[PDB]
Amino acid sequence: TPDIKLFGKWSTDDVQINDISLQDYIAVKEKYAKYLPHSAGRYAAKRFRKAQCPIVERLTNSMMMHGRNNGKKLMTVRIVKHAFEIIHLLTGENPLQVLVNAIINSGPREDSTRIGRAGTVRRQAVDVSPLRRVNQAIWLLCTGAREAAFRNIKTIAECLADELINAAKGSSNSYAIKKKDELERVAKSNR
Amino acid sequence: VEQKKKRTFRKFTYRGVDLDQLLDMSYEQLMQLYSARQRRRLSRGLRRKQHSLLKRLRKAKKEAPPMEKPEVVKTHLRDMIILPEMVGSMVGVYNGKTFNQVEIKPEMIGHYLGEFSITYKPVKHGR
Amino acid sequence: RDKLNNLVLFDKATYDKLCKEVPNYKLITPAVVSERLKIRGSLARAALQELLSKGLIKLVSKHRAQVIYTRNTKG
Amino acid sequence: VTVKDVNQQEFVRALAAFLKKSGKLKVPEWVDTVKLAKHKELAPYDENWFYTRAASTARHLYLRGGAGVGSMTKIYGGRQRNGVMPSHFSRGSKSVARRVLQALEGLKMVEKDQDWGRKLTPQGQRDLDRIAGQVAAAKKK
Amino acid sequence: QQLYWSHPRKFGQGSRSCRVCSNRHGLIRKYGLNMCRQCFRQYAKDIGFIKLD
Amino acid sequence: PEKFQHILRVLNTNIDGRRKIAFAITAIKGVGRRYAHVVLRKADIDLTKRAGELTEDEVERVITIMQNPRQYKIPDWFLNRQKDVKDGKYSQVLANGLDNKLREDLERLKKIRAHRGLRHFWGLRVRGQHTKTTGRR
RNA sequence: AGCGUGUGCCUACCCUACGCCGGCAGGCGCGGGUAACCCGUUGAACCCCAUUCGUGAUGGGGAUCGGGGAUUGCAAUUAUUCCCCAUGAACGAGGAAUUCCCAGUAAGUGCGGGUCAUAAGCUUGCGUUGAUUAAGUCCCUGCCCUUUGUACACACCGCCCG
């Protein structure tokens, strides 16, 4: 704790958002290292503020989904802490770096909007903001991990690690990666 | 109902206890055994009060010929508990508009009069 | 689908499979043992605690809910 | 260690075992049959559990001025699944806790306290503190 | 004299009313006021129940 | 470790062996979970296992306890048939025998022509429930 | 942990800690309290956790029914209710549709008050755990804003032809 403010026990320093633009709604800690993926957190009042929120916590929040799981942050924090450990065993590294990478890789660059189009409503290829890219990615990965975990013996921490790792280097094994490519493919036509 | 076989031959023991034995105690010693809901009702009923009814039962038990059934005894006391003192009698059991007539077999024991006079009518969907 | 039926008692040969395989895997939890063999899940468990013997496998967290084991301690 | 020094799970775990070795506690012949709470789904997997509760209670009393069975029933009492209805508290048995309280007395761990409620005795206070130390001593880890 | 004429009135809806209006329905029994809600609405100012929030 | 059985029979029901004993037993009519759990505890078994495992010995031992529960520190309140009536029993009916007694009881109050009996006979309801909107299909 | 609650009452009656018996449900003996004093440092519940289970409508689910224990009441049968066992359903994610919602907010989660003799799946608050997500706009919907048209004015749910 006093030397450097590590994560559960992981270093914030030396993790670099390998992707210009995204830089910065992915919030590691260009100084902000903490200890735990839990905070009082008031993000809601402002439109932007959410970006400030540590990406780790942001990921943890998205974890607690589905009516029953709402509000179970302690459970998510527990899952997140485990996932980072599994990821680390799987590739060394900073699992936090692994997390960041998956996020960078998953945000749909291009997308589609349902432009009115007269009749046979066609869809217009539009580029996607970086806030959306981050927001969307974290969903994709969480929905990916949650969906996989449900009928299988494997635990969310594990499924999360699997989704995160495959995405970190976009294996396309991942549900999320396949989804992102699908959303983008759609963006390109339409145009 | 007195002698070798004659009439007798329907048996029935209540709670390990035999109807020979049943018919001979006190309602006291019967409710003592097992029934629990009926027993509490009679205790709390108590003071007790279907007094006249019970005398109306024995009365018509007497005046009945010597072979069979006889005339019956009416009542509105649906909440009454059947006890061995009653068995063999005939009870007009009101349901709201009708008095259904029912002989009380020894099996009924511990049951409530109301369970043998249906109020409602089955019903109907098609017809 | 996914119908899973599990061998719920030791079969010798399946005892051999266990110690001669599991050193193969980097990740082993209940599920792994279950899928890669056809172990009960109940008899997965007992195999985990046993394996941690003096280990084939090594603990990194056995959160109440989850064991998470690594490969044995090789080169 | 004060008992307060040792973590609750290890403390209870160690003491409960110590009681088991001592061999003299005493035990409503039942304990095989009993659930421990109407709320309860199944009885206790560790049929051996009578000891664990005793330890738990002894520790529970030592902490506080005086406690009685009703409190314990509730403490043990979990949520009961109404089924159709929403779940609600249901303070857990009173025979087990009582017997636990009576039995503990036999050892003198606890004694009737003034103004109702059982309190720890100095004999018990001494006994718990002693095991507490043993647990602290075992190891780091 | 007419032993005839009553059955228990001790408890239930039938054992109470409105000190104001007889009504055995929607009765405020809290704090011993024992007013039916419709009446209590009309008398809450004179009783000392005032609107604040 | 070891093996054997899959598929064992106790008193007239087929009991999957793969399954855990407590749960495995609960196929038998009249053995619910609270039952079978307490029976086994009485019957001395390593709780930790699969019905398919265990011995012919232990099995008779389960059955013997199962049909004389009272005689083994199982309280009567734990029991399906207290207070018989016809014999003033206590009892815990088991196996094929539960279907049997169910039939009896229904017959009893159908003979007597009690409204419940009648309800069972038409195939309606006997506890006080409204019959206007539900149990329609 | 928190909002709240109580007897000594417009006419019959309170909240209840603590000892004992009972597996439970509950039974029984006490003793305080017009209460910031006592019940109640409301030692709640989610939750957290060391185990078991292992992805089987299974241990998910708790329907229906049978027997039985007890509580309220003079009276519960047409279950007031509660428990104990047993019987152990559909349901393995919901079409057309559609409600509501921006921060302690949605959602999980227990508690207390009203009803009340007894009886909560209700309503009505309260704390606890606590996100995702717009941060805007008038598209649909709804209502008021101009301008405009109107054979309408019981006002479009209006006034029409053979």
Side-chain angles (χ1 to χ4, degrees):
Chain A
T1 179
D3 290 324
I4 182 151
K5 292 206 16 289
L6 295 184
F7 201 31
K9 308 148 139 199
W10 305 102
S11 178
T12 299
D13 294 358
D14 198 8
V15 175
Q16 342 74 199
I17 295 100
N18 297 278
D19 183 348
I20 191 169
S21 76
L22 289 183
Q23 111 177 314
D24 319 345
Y25 305 50
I26 296 170
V28 39
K29 69 349 105 26
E30 346 78 273
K31 201 9 229 242
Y32 285 57
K34 276 43 162 37
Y35 297 98
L36 234 354
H38 194 287
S39 297
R42 46 170 208 131
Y43 298 96
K46 281 151 131 179
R47 151 197 240 227
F48 279 106
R49 218 121 88 192
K50 198 209 269 104
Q52 248 355 112
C53 181
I55 57 168
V56 175
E57 166 174 282
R58 236 155 137 24
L59 196 188
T60 66
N61 298 329
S62 297
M63 205 10 214
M64 52 180 171
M65 299 220 132
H66 271 230
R68 53 145 196 196
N69 315 323
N70 293 172
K72 265 129 221 206
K73 199 160 181 177
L74 298 181
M75 225 322 167
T76 194
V77 174
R78 240 24 311 180
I79 296 169
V80 175
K81 225 315 230 88
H82 269 345
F84 306 82
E85 242 147 55
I86 294 169
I87 298 168
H88 167 106
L89 297 181
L90 177 63
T91 312
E93 237 181 306
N94 281 286
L96 194 180
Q97 273 281 193
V98 176
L99 188 179
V100 63
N101 296 132
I103 336 332
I104 298 166
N105 295 340
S106 305
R109 283 107 253 249
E110 29 264 86
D111 198 22
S112 136
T113 180
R114 131 270 261 282
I115 241 234
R117 240 245 230 110
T120 299
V121 167
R122 324 262 213 198
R123 280 68 229 209
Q124 192 54 260
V126 293
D127 316 279
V128 357
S129 180
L131 179 58
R132 264 3 238 271
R133 308 231 282 110
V134 174
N135 293 1
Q136 294 300 320
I138 294 170
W139 277 81
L140 300 181
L141 62 80
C142 299
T143 299
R146 175 176 316 112
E147 196 158 295
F150 173 72
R151 303 249 239 249
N152 184 251
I153 301 70
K154 220 236 268 325
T155 65
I156 325 295
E158 183 65 13
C159 180
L160 196 264
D162 150 26
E163 195 58 19
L164 241 232
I165 298 172
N166 290 350
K169 231 235 298 357
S171 178
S172 299
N173 197 175
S174 178
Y175 168 81
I177 198 268
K178 289 191 217 47
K179 201 351 159 225
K180 194 232 151 161
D181 184 1
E182 285 1 316
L183 290 180
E184 288 190 315
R185 167 183 162 268
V186 175
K188 170 115 200 210
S189 329
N190 295 341
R191 102 201 150 149
Chain B
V1 175
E2 60 236 291
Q3 285 261 231
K4 47 244 6 239
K5 293 179 179 179
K6 138 200 156 147
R7 38 107 263 277
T8 192
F9 222 134
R10 294 280 248 227
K11 26 193 153 127
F12 241 162
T13 67
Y14 126 83
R15 262 188 213 189
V17 173
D18 290 345
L19 62 80
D20 181 65
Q21 183 65 260
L22 295 174
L23 296 174
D24 290 345
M25 320 281 184
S26 61
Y27 63 89
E28 293 177 350
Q29 294 177 335
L30 177 63
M31 5 148 17
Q32 293 177 335
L33 292 165
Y34 292 188
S35 56
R37 224 344 222 258
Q38 179 320 299
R39 37 183 208 176
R40 242 341 132 196
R41 208 196 40 85
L42 296 174
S43 63
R44 291 177 64 84
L46 181 35
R47 345 149 123 177
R48 306 51 188 259
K49 214 339 109 140
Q50 274 110 332
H51 302 291
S52 65
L53 295 174
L54 275 66
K55 292 179 179 179
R56 181 177 181 170
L57 295 174
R58 133 172 158 243
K59 183 169 71 172
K61 218 94 171 321
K62 64 179 180 180
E63 294 177 350
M67 177 75 246
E68 278 125 83
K69 40 149 104 206
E71 100 160 308
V72 175
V73 175
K74 304 172 166 189
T75 61
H76 300 356
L77 296 174
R78 278 171 78 63
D79 65 9
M80 184 164 19
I81 264 104
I82 293 169
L83 17 171
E85 123 108 84
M86 250 141 292
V87 171
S89 178
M90 293 300 293
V91 175
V93 176
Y94 200 63
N95 288 337
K97 20 75 218 210
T98 59
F99 276 94
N100 290 337
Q101 235 182 245
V102 177
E103 181 189 31
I104 61 171
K105 279 130 203 199
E107 22 292 11
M108 348 180 119
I109 294 169
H111 301 291
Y112 292 93
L113 295 174
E115 294 177 350
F116 296 97
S117 63
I118 61 171
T119 220
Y120 63 89
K121 114 122 123 92
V123 154
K124 76 97 327 46
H125 292 341
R127 301 84 176 151
Chain C
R1 295 176 64 186
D2 181 0
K3 176 179 256 179
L4 156 319
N5 257 343
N6 289 337
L7 295 174
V8 177
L9 177 63
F10 257 9
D11 288 345
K12 244 251 203 255
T14 59
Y15 174 74
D16 289 345
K17 294 179 179 179
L18 296 174
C19 297
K20 299 296 183 181
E21 293 177 350
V22 178
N24 289 337
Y25 345 136
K26 283 167 254 203
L27 275 66
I28 293 169
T29 57
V32 174
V33 174
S34 65
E35 63 185 342
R36 297 294 181 192
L37 294 174
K38 299 296 183 181
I39 191 66
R40 173 77 197 129
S42 63
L43 295 174
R45 257 173 33 30
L48 295 174
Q49 293 177 335
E50 292 177 350
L51 260 215
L52 295 174
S53 295
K54 174 338 89 193
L56 292 174
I57 61 171
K58 179 62 173 171
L59 296 174
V60 175
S61 35
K62 349 201 233 150
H63 145 113
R64 201 26 211 27
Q66 296 177 335
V67 276
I68 295 169
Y69 295 93
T70 59
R71 185 182 295 276
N72 340 60
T73 45
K74 75 272 233 96
Chain D
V1 316
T2 192
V3 305
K4 289 171 173 291
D5 293 336
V6 180
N7 289 337
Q8 243 256 43
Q9 272 145 52
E10 63 185 342
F11 180 93
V12 299
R13 248 167 135 38
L15 180 63
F18 147 115
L19 292 190
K20 288 294 248 44
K21 277 323 287 213
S22 180
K24 50 163 188 169
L25 198 235
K26 308 296 342 187
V27 324
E29 183 178 2
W30 50 85
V31 167
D32 296 82
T33 186
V34 176
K35 236 35 131 24
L36 188 66
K38 74 193 214 101
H39 280 21
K40 303 292 94 138
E41 4 269 338
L42 177 63
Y45 303 139
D46 192 47
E47 318 171 333
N48 290 351
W49 62 273
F50 213 69
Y51 297 98
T52 194
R53 172 184 279 258
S56 180
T57 299
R59 96 149 244 300
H60 190 279
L61 322 214
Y62 169 108
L63 268 207
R64 326 103 200 286
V69 145
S71 180
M72 294 300 293
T73 63
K74 180 168 176 177
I75 194 68
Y76 291 101
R79 290 144 8 237
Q80 105 74 43
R81 220 205 299 353
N82 290 240
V84 60
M85 333 124 241
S87 41
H88 339 204
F89 206 52
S90 234
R91 283 212 250 316
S93 167
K94 331 97 186 106
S95 180
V96 296
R98 180 182 62 209
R99 246 3 183 200
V100 174
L101 293 184
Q102 296 154 0
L104 307 179
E105 280 211 70
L107 297 182
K108 279 126 209 219
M109 275 303 192
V110 295
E111 62 187 8
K112 54 232 288 177
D113 184 31
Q114 26 185 52
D115 325 311
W116 312 101
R118 251 89 125 183
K119 63 168 176 179
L120 67 180
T121 198
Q123 168 181 191
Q125 182 171 170
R126 183 272 197 199
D127 126 66
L128 277 277
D129 277 16
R130 194 119 145 137
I131 65 162
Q134 298 191 352
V135 176
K139 291 179 179 179
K140 169 36 123 83
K141 96 165 358 304
Chain E
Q1 293 177 335
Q2 294 177 335
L3 290 173
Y4 26 88
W5 189 240
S6 295
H7 139 308
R9 202 49 81 169
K10 98 161 115 144
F11 59 88
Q13 17 183 69
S15 67
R16 10 191 198 65
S17 65
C18 184
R19 292 181 295 103
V20 177
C21 72
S22 295
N23 290 337
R24 338 126 78 301
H25 309 296
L27 208 213
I28 303 301
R29 199 153 56 103
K30 231 219 140 160
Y31 296 138
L33 275 66
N34 289 337
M35 291 300 293
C36 93
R37 67 195 184 99
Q38 284 92 318
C39 279
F40 177 80
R41 243 173 98 56
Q42 293 177 335
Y43 301 23
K45 303 296 199 78
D46 290 345
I47 294 169
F49 295 97
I50 252 217
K51 301 193 224 167
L52 296 174
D53 108 71
Chain F
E2 253 45 4
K3 316 69 116 18
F4 335 150
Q5 300 143 110
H6 344 69
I7 273 11
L8 316 185
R9 165 169 261 278
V10 174
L11 190 60
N12 347 304
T13 58
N14 288 337
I15 293 169
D16 253 356
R18 181 74 17 102
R19 285 227 145 162
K20 183 178 179 180
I21 295 169
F23 294 92
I25 308 171
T26 60
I28 295 169
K29 276 32 153 340
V31 1
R33 242 176 103 199
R34 231 347 244 299
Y35 178 75
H37 207 45
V38 175
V39 175
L40 294 174
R41 256 202 78 153
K42 278 288 193 218
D44 280 319
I45 284 129
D46 177 22
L47 62 80
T48 60
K49 271 190 210 130
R50 282 323 186 289
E53 335 186 270
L54 317 8
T55 59
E56 31 182 16
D57 290 345
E58 242 106 69
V59 296
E60 314 170 357
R61 182 57 57 85
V62 174
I63 294 169
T64 58
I65 294 169
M66 103 157 181
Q67 186 173 355
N68 288 337
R70 202 169 29 122
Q71 295 85 0
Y72 296 93
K73 296 123 208 250
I74 292 169
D76 289 345
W77 51 262
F78 177 80
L79 297 174
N80 78 331
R81 253 181 99 103
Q82 331 217 285
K83 258 200 295 201
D84 214 333
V85 146
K86 306 309 107 175
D87 326 64
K89 293 224 108 29
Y90 304 5
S91 295
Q92 186 173 355
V93 175
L94 296 174
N96 64 34
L98 62 80
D99 181 65
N100 289 337
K101 282 321 197 164
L102 177 63
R103 181 177 65 83
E104 293 177 350
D105 289 345
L106 295 174
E107 292 177 350
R108 181 177 65 83
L109 295 174
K110 183 180 68 65
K111 183 178 179 180
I112 296 169
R113 52 235 174 230
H115 166 130
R116 293 182 183 174
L118 295 174
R119 294 183 181 277
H120 217 109
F121 177 80
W122 294 356
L124 300 178
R125 251 126 229 220
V126 177
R127 329 237 175 184
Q129 18 259 134
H130 298 191
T131 58
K132 134 180 243 180
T133 61
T134 45
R136 324 208 195 119
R137 235 310 93 182

